[PDB]
Amino acid sequence: MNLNATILGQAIAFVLFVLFCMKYVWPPLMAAIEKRQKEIADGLASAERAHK
Protein backbone atom coordinates (compact mmCIF):
# COMPACT_ATOMS: atom_id res chain seq x y z
CA MET A 1 0.00 0.00 0.00
CA ASN A 2 0.86 3.69 -0.34
CA LEU A 3 1.64 5.68 2.84
CA ASN A 4 1.91 9.22 1.34
CA ALA A 5 -1.82 9.72 2.11
CA THR A 6 -0.78 10.06 5.80
CA ILE A 7 0.73 13.51 5.06
CA LEU A 8 -2.59 14.92 3.79
CA GLY A 9 -4.53 13.14 6.53
CA GLN A 10 -2.50 14.45 9.50
CA ALA A 11 -2.16 17.97 8.02
CA ILE A 12 -5.93 18.48 7.48
CA ALA A 13 -6.82 16.96 10.87
CA PHE A 14 -4.43 19.20 12.85
CA VAL A 15 -5.73 22.39 11.16
CA LEU A 16 -9.37 21.53 12.01
CA PHE A 17 -8.27 20.59 15.54
CA VAL A 18 -6.84 24.14 15.93
CA LEU A 19 -10.06 25.66 14.47
CA PHE A 20 -12.16 24.10 17.25
CA CYS A 21 -9.57 25.09 19.89
CA MET A 22 -9.14 28.72 18.84
CA LYS A 23 -12.84 29.50 18.43
CA TYR A 24 -14.06 27.64 21.56
CA VAL A 25 -11.09 27.10 23.91
CA TRP A 26 -8.84 30.14 23.67
CA PRO A 27 -11.76 32.54 24.55
CA PRO A 28 -12.46 30.94 27.98
CA LEU A 29 -8.72 30.92 28.69
CA MET A 30 -8.32 34.61 27.82
CA ALA A 31 -11.57 35.50 29.62
CA ALA A 32 -10.67 33.82 32.90
CA ILE A 33 -7.37 35.72 32.48
CA GLU A 34 -9.23 39.01 31.93
CA LYS A 35 -11.49 38.20 34.89
CA ARG A 36 -8.45 37.54 37.10
CA GLN A 37 -6.69 40.70 35.71
CA LYS A 38 -9.68 42.93 36.73
CA GLU A 39 -8.96 42.22 40.47
CA ILE A 40 -5.70 44.06 40.25
CA ALA A 41 -7.45 47.02 38.50
CA ASP A 42 -10.24 47.19 41.19
CA GLY A 43 -7.68 46.61 43.98
CA LEU A 44 -5.45 49.45 42.72
CA ALA A 45 -8.48 51.76 42.20
CA SER A 46 -9.88 51.06 45.70
CA ALA A 47 -6.38 51.32 47.27
CA GLU A 48 -5.58 54.60 45.42
CA ARG A 49 -8.87 56.38 46.38
CA ALA A 50 -8.78 54.99 49.98
CA HIS A 51 -5.15 56.17 50.45
CA LYS A 52 -6.33 59.50 49.04
Binding site: M1, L3, A5, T6, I7, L8, G9, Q10, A11, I12, A13, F14, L16, F17, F20, C21, V25, L29, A32, I33, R36, Q37, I40, A41, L44
Partner: protein, 266 residues
Protein backbone atom coordinates in the same frame (compact mmCIF):
# COMPACT_ATOMS: atom_id res chain seq x y z
CA UNK B 1 9.17 -0.03 1.26
CA UNK B 2 7.86 -3.44 2.30
CA UNK B 3 6.05 -2.36 5.49
CA UNK B 4 2.62 -3.96 5.53
CA UNK B 5 0.01 -2.06 7.58
CA UNK B 6 0.42 -4.44 10.52
CA UNK B 7 4.20 -4.10 10.18
CA UNK B 8 4.18 -0.29 9.86
CA UNK B 9 2.13 -0.19 13.10
CA UNK B 10 4.82 -2.29 14.83
CA UNK B 11 7.57 0.35 14.46
CA UNK B 12 5.62 2.93 16.51
CA UNK B 13 5.03 0.38 19.28
CA UNK B 14 8.84 -0.19 19.46
CA UNK B 15 11.15 1.92 21.67
CA UNK B 16 14.65 3.40 21.28
CA UNK B 17 16.58 1.70 24.12
CA UNK B 18 20.30 1.78 24.97
CA UNK B 19 22.35 -1.17 26.19
CA UNK B 20 24.96 -0.29 28.86
CA UNK B 21 26.85 -3.60 28.57
CA UNK B 22 27.59 -2.98 24.89
CA UNK B 23 27.19 0.82 25.18
CA UNK B 24 25.08 0.69 22.02
CA UNK B 25 21.67 1.61 20.59
CA UNK B 26 19.08 -1.12 19.99
CA UNK B 27 18.00 -1.70 16.40
CA UNK B 28 14.30 -2.44 15.75
CA UNK B 29 14.82 -6.21 16.07
CA UNK B 30 17.29 -7.12 18.82
CA UNK B 31 16.07 -7.82 22.39
CA UNK B 32 16.89 -6.30 25.81
CA UNK B 33 19.94 -8.30 26.91
CA UNK B 34 19.76 -6.85 30.44
CA UNK B 35 17.83 -4.59 32.82
CA UNK B 36 20.43 -1.83 32.17
CA UNK B 37 18.75 -0.66 28.90
CA UNK B 38 17.32 2.89 29.27
CA UNK B 39 14.59 4.22 26.91
CA UNK B 40 16.40 7.22 25.36
CA UNK B 41 13.37 8.68 23.49
CA UNK B 42 11.08 8.82 26.56
CA UNK B 43 13.76 10.54 28.69
CA UNK B 44 14.96 12.93 25.94
CA UNK B 45 11.44 14.28 25.30
CA UNK B 46 10.59 14.24 29.04
CA UNK B 47 13.54 16.46 30.11
CA UNK B 48 13.23 18.98 27.22
CA UNK B 49 9.56 19.47 28.19
CA UNK B 50 10.69 19.90 31.80
CA UNK B 51 13.18 22.62 30.86
CA UNK B 52 10.68 24.59 28.77
CA UNK B 53 8.34 24.73 31.76
CA UNK B 54 11.10 25.58 34.28
CA UNK B 55 12.77 28.22 32.05
CA UNK B 56 9.50 29.99 31.12
CA UNK B 57 8.30 29.99 34.76
CA UNK B 58 11.66 31.04 36.29
CA UNK B 59 11.84 33.89 33.77
CA UNK B 60 8.52 35.19 35.17
CA UNK B 61 9.29 34.13 38.75
CA UNK B 62 12.24 36.56 38.67
CA UNK B 63 9.95 39.28 37.23
CA UNK B 64 6.52 38.98 38.96
CA UNK B 65 4.94 42.10 40.54
CA UNK B 66 1.97 43.16 42.68
CA UNK B 67 0.69 45.40 39.89
CA UNK B 68 -1.22 44.24 36.86
CA UNK B 69 0.68 41.18 35.59
CA UNK B 70 1.99 40.66 32.10
CA UNK B 71 -0.46 38.55 30.12
CA UNK B 72 1.84 35.49 29.88
CA UNK B 73 2.64 36.01 33.59
CA UNK B 74 -1.14 36.18 34.22
CA UNK B 75 -1.59 32.60 32.96
CA UNK B 76 1.34 31.40 35.12
CA UNK B 77 -0.13 33.05 38.22
CA UNK B 78 -3.58 31.68 37.25
CA UNK B 79 -2.31 28.08 37.07
CA UNK B 80 -0.67 28.92 40.39
CA UNK B 81 -4.25 29.89 41.24
CA UNK B 82 -5.59 26.43 40.43
CA UNK B 83 -2.64 24.75 42.19
CA UNK B 84 -2.72 26.91 45.31
CA UNK B 85 -6.52 26.67 45.38
CA UNK B 86 -6.33 22.88 45.56
CA UNK B 87 -3.42 22.83 48.03
CA UNK B 88 -5.14 25.54 50.08
CA UNK B 89 -8.01 23.33 51.22
CA UNK B 90 -6.86 19.71 50.92
CA UNK B 91 -3.64 20.29 52.88
CA UNK B 92 -3.63 21.70 56.41
CA UNK B 93 -0.14 21.04 57.83
CA UNK B 94 2.95 23.23 57.83
CA UNK B 95 5.07 21.40 55.25
CA UNK B 96 6.63 23.47 52.48
CA UNK B 97 7.24 20.62 50.06
CA UNK B 98 3.57 19.81 49.33
CA UNK B 99 2.83 22.78 47.07
CA UNK B 100 5.83 22.60 44.64
CA UNK B 101 5.48 18.82 44.70
CA UNK B 102 1.93 19.12 43.39
CA UNK B 103 2.82 21.91 40.92
CA UNK B 104 5.82 20.19 39.29
CA UNK B 105 3.79 16.99 39.02
CA UNK B 106 0.77 18.68 37.42
CA UNK B 107 2.48 20.85 34.78
CA UNK B 108 5.20 18.32 33.88
CA UNK B 109 2.73 15.42 33.63
CA UNK B 110 0.59 17.58 31.34
CA UNK B 111 3.50 18.50 29.10
CA UNK B 112 4.26 14.84 28.41
CA UNK B 113 0.62 14.27 27.38
CA UNK B 114 0.16 17.44 25.25
CA UNK B 115 2.87 16.14 22.87
CA UNK B 116 0.62 13.19 21.90
CA UNK B 117 -1.59 15.42 19.74
CA UNK B 118 1.51 16.18 17.63
CA UNK B 119 1.30 14.34 14.24
CA UNK B 120 2.20 10.73 14.85
CA UNK B 121 4.64 10.11 11.94
CA UNK B 122 6.23 13.58 11.60
CA UNK B 123 8.84 13.62 14.41
CA UNK B 124 9.79 9.93 14.06
CA UNK B 125 10.64 10.91 10.45
CA UNK B 126 13.23 13.43 11.65
CA UNK B 127 14.35 10.68 14.03
CA UNK B 128 14.87 7.99 11.37
CA UNK B 129 15.44 9.73 8.03
CA UNK B 130 17.53 12.64 9.30
CA UNK B 131 19.63 11.72 12.34
CA UNK B 132 19.74 7.98 11.56
CA UNK B 133 17.68 6.60 14.47
CA UNK B 134 16.08 3.16 14.23
CA UNK B 135 12.80 4.04 16.03
CA UNK B 136 10.80 6.62 17.94
CA UNK B 137 7.59 7.43 19.81
CA UNK B 138 6.61 10.84 21.11
CA UNK B 139 4.77 10.41 24.45
CA UNK B 140 6.87 9.88 27.61
CA UNK B 141 3.90 8.79 29.76
CA UNK B 142 3.09 5.96 27.30
CA UNK B 143 6.22 4.22 28.63
CA UNK B 144 5.43 2.50 31.95
CA UNK B 145 8.77 3.15 33.68
CA UNK B 146 8.30 6.94 33.93
CA UNK B 147 4.88 6.59 35.61
CA UNK B 148 6.17 3.91 38.04
CA UNK B 149 9.23 6.00 38.97
CA UNK B 150 7.01 8.97 39.93
CA UNK B 151 4.30 6.83 41.62
CA UNK B 152 6.91 4.86 43.58
CA UNK B 153 8.33 8.28 44.43
CA UNK B 154 4.93 9.18 45.96
CA UNK B 155 4.98 5.77 47.67
CA UNK B 156 8.32 6.72 49.29
CA UNK B 157 6.70 10.04 50.28
CA UNK B 158 3.66 8.27 51.78
CA UNK B 159 5.92 6.15 54.00
CA UNK B 160 8.13 9.15 54.79
CA UNK B 161 5.44 11.72 55.66
CA UNK B 162 3.29 9.24 57.58
CA UNK B 163 6.14 8.00 59.78
CA UNK B 164 7.35 11.56 60.27
CA UNK B 165 3.98 12.88 61.43
CA UNK B 166 2.79 10.03 63.66
CA UNK B 167 5.81 7.77 64.23
CA UNK B 168 6.15 4.00 64.07
CA UNK B 169 4.43 3.45 67.42
CA UNK B 170 1.04 4.40 66.03
CA UNK B 171 1.80 3.37 62.46
CA UNK B 172 2.16 -0.24 63.60
CA UNK B 173 -1.14 -0.03 65.50
CA UNK B 174 -3.00 1.23 62.42
CA UNK B 175 -1.36 -1.23 60.03
CA UNK B 176 -2.24 -4.18 62.29
CA UNK B 177 -5.44 -3.55 64.26
CA UNK B 178 -7.60 -2.27 61.43
CA UNK B 179 -10.27 -2.83 60.35
CA UNK B 180 -11.80 -5.24 62.93
CA UNK B 181 -9.72 -4.04 65.93
CA UNK B 182 -9.97 -7.31 67.90
CA UNK B 183 -6.67 -8.88 68.76
CA UNK B 184 -7.21 -12.32 67.20
CA UNK B 185 -7.53 -10.81 63.71
CA UNK B 186 -4.21 -8.95 63.70
CA UNK B 187 -2.15 -11.34 61.48
CA UNK B 188 -4.92 -11.47 58.87
CA UNK B 189 -5.54 -7.73 59.28
CA UNK B 190 -2.05 -6.64 58.21
CA UNK B 191 -2.23 -8.69 55.00
CA UNK B 192 -5.30 -6.80 53.81
CA UNK B 193 -4.03 -3.36 54.92
CA UNK B 194 -0.57 -3.89 53.47
CA UNK B 195 -1.67 -4.62 49.90
CA UNK B 196 -4.28 -1.86 50.26
CA UNK B 197 -1.38 0.57 50.72
CA UNK B 198 0.54 -0.72 47.66
CA UNK B 199 -2.64 -0.49 45.58
CA UNK B 200 -2.51 3.31 46.06
CA UNK B 201 0.63 4.08 43.96
CA UNK B 202 -0.27 1.31 41.49
CA UNK B 203 -3.56 3.10 40.80
CA UNK B 204 -1.51 6.17 39.83
CA UNK B 205 0.93 4.33 37.60
CA UNK B 206 -1.50 2.12 35.67
CA UNK B 207 -4.30 4.66 35.07
CA UNK B 208 -1.91 7.37 33.82
CA UNK B 209 0.10 5.02 31.58
CA UNK B 210 -2.92 3.17 30.18
CA UNK B 211 -4.70 6.30 28.92
CA UNK B 212 -1.61 7.61 27.08
CA UNK B 213 -0.50 4.20 25.76
CA UNK B 214 -4.06 3.58 24.47
CA UNK B 215 -4.15 7.18 23.28
CA UNK B 216 -1.08 6.84 21.00
CA UNK B 217 -2.09 3.39 19.69
CA UNK B 218 -5.31 4.86 18.23
CA UNK B 219 -3.23 7.46 16.37
CA UNK B 220 -0.91 4.67 15.17
CA UNK B 221 -3.96 2.83 13.79
CA UNK B 222 -5.45 6.01 12.27
CA UNK B 223 -2.21 6.60 10.34
CA UNK B 224 -1.65 2.93 9.46
CA UNK B 225 -4.96 1.60 8.17
CA UNK B 226 -6.77 4.31 6.25
CA UNK B 227 -6.99 6.64 3.25
CA UNK B 228 -6.19 10.31 3.76
CA UNK B 229 -9.78 11.63 3.63
CA UNK B 230 -10.90 9.12 6.29
CA UNK B 231 -7.81 9.77 8.42
CA UNK B 232 -8.71 13.44 8.98
CA UNK B 233 -12.40 12.98 9.85
CA UNK B 234 -11.66 10.18 12.33
CA UNK B 235 -8.68 12.06 13.82
CA UNK B 236 -10.67 15.31 14.50
CA UNK B 237 -13.28 13.80 16.90
CA UNK B 238 -10.51 11.79 18.62
CA UNK B 239 -8.51 14.98 19.23
CA UNK B 240 -11.55 16.70 20.84
CA UNK B 241 -11.86 13.72 23.20
CA UNK B 242 -8.13 13.23 23.85
CA UNK B 243 -7.94 16.91 24.90
CA UNK B 244 -10.24 16.04 27.78
CA UNK B 245 -8.33 12.88 28.77
CA UNK B 246 -4.85 14.45 28.73
CA UNK B 247 -6.03 17.29 30.98
CA UNK B 248 -8.02 15.14 33.42
CA UNK B 249 -5.18 12.65 34.02
CA UNK B 250 -2.86 15.49 35.00
CA UNK B 251 -5.50 16.90 37.34
CA UNK B 252 -6.37 13.50 38.85
CA UNK B 253 -2.72 12.61 39.53
CA UNK B 254 -2.20 15.97 41.24
CA UNK B 255 -5.30 15.75 43.45
CA UNK B 256 -4.75 12.07 44.28
CA UNK B 257 -1.15 12.72 45.31
CA UNK B 258 -2.20 15.40 47.82
CA UNK B 259 -5.19 13.36 49.05
CA UNK B 260 -3.15 10.17 49.51
CA UNK B 261 -0.52 11.97 51.57
CA UNK B 262 -3.04 14.08 53.51
CA UNK B 263 -4.93 10.90 54.46
CA UNK B 264 -1.81 9.48 56.13
CA UNK B 265 -0.26 12.52 57.82
CA UNK B 266 -3.13 14.81 58.87
Amino acid sequence: ENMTPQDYIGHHLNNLQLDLRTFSLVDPQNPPATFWTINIDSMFFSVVLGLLFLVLFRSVAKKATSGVPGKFQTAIELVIGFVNGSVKDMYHGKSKLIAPLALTIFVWVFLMNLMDLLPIDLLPYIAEHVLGLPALRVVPSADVNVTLSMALGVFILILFYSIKMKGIGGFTKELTLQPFNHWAFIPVNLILEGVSLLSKPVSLGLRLFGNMYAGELIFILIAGLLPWWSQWILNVPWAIFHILIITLQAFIFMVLTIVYLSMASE
